[PDB]
């Protein structure tokens with residue numbers, strides 16, 4: 472099996488001592504091909520990049536979700552929430568069954584009004600800019616997506632658009648995820664030099680956990696008859712065990728949904744707008760759909776479902792830059808991958824989603840081009856070729872929520888504004904386990920359509 476350059480007794484570990492590890496891993500994959508071994512002290516994994524091999528890795532009878540080294544570190548705050556629990560933990564399947572009804576079609580129609588509430592605040596912010604003022608795109612998209620999960624999921628208002636600086640929850644969430652990414656490259660984690668990093672880390676987690684207490688305390692005290700994600704967490708019973716979630720698991724789910732429910736979606740909207748302003752003919756086509764379909768001051772749920780081309784733009788943005796770029800798997804038993812790489816039970820794999828999404832045998836030769844038309848008929852895509860939301864029973868539970876929000880917001884953006892890439896921005900991808908085009912700015916000129 473191919474393997475990139477090694478560093479003596481540190482093996483390949485120094486290759487991930489960079490600000491852009493995923494981007495470093497993609498270039499290794501370009502150099503070495505569909506599979507490559509990556510060793511660290513006392514650790515080994517195999518990075519897969521081709522649909523040929525990933526279609527076997529997505530075989531659930533042979534491989535199950537692994538918690539990567541990164542996810543093990545985040546589990547200190549995510550606990551046994553849906554995202555950081557093993558498939559075999561009781562709390563995974565319980566919460567899985569209890570919370571899927573929160574993403575039913577009827578649940579989605581119920582979220583739509585509060586999504587519009589936040590989308591209108593975004594549009595109003597941009598409409599209220601003075602001449603020649605610009606937009607900080609990932610910053611405002613994070614304002615929107617954080618507020619949307621807070622309100623739709625928990626009837627809690629982060630009021631991000633009333634702030635020039637990030638919400639304290641996000642300040643502690645980013646620093647706590649920074650501490651988790653730095654534990655990967657640190658030899659002796661229980662050494663006195665990191666005594667204060669750990670002090671910071673645990674105070675950043677109590678910031679996040681104090682908000683959680685408030686969301687819970689205000690639901691119990693509230694009179695309003697709510698039917699949202701928190702309703703199901705507090706009241707839903709698992710049809711299989713007959714049990715509801717317990718108090719400590721509930722806290723983990725709230726923290727999980729608040730973080731997983733906004734970061735990757737903000738990344739998606741950021742990349743989508745980036746590709747639109749870089750591809751003016753695509754932007755014009757998407758804008759024409761938005762104008763044709765969104766005939767009312769606020770979009771209906773049905774109208775969002777009719778934004779076919781906008782949906783295609785979002786999928787094409789997810790192909791080039793899947794915002795959660797790598798997922799980890801482990802072999803359920805001894806097995807042979809691709810008829811030439813034998814694996815033993817427990818052997819770990821990493822699916823490099825951006826490399827899978829550039830497989831020339833599936834997508835053709837123009838893999839770097841932004842062409843939404845490749846999603847004209849989504850059924851034409853072979854199995855396991857397009858995986859921005861993961862695999863099987865461990866796939867993203869919030870997929871339809873993220874895509875409905877992103878389609879709604881992007882449709883309104885295209886309806887209400889013309890956009891200008893006034894700095895001719897140079898794509899610079901920031902990695903914090905998720906991806907975002909750092910420093911992306913635009914100018915918007917309103918088409919002066921009332922809300």
Ligand code: HEM
Nearest residue numbers: 553554731732735736739795798860861865867868869873
């Ligand atoms: C474009 C936006 C999103 C992307 C690209 C994305 C990506 C993913 C991926 C790749 C996984 C599988 C993780 C793994 O295999 O380790 C996943 C799982 C998950 N996502 Fe998302 N996600 C997005 C939005 C959301 C939203 C909006 C929510 C909540 C409302 C959410 C909540 C979760 C949860 C709880 C899981 C774990 C599910 C389980 O294992 O049962 N995500 N997501």
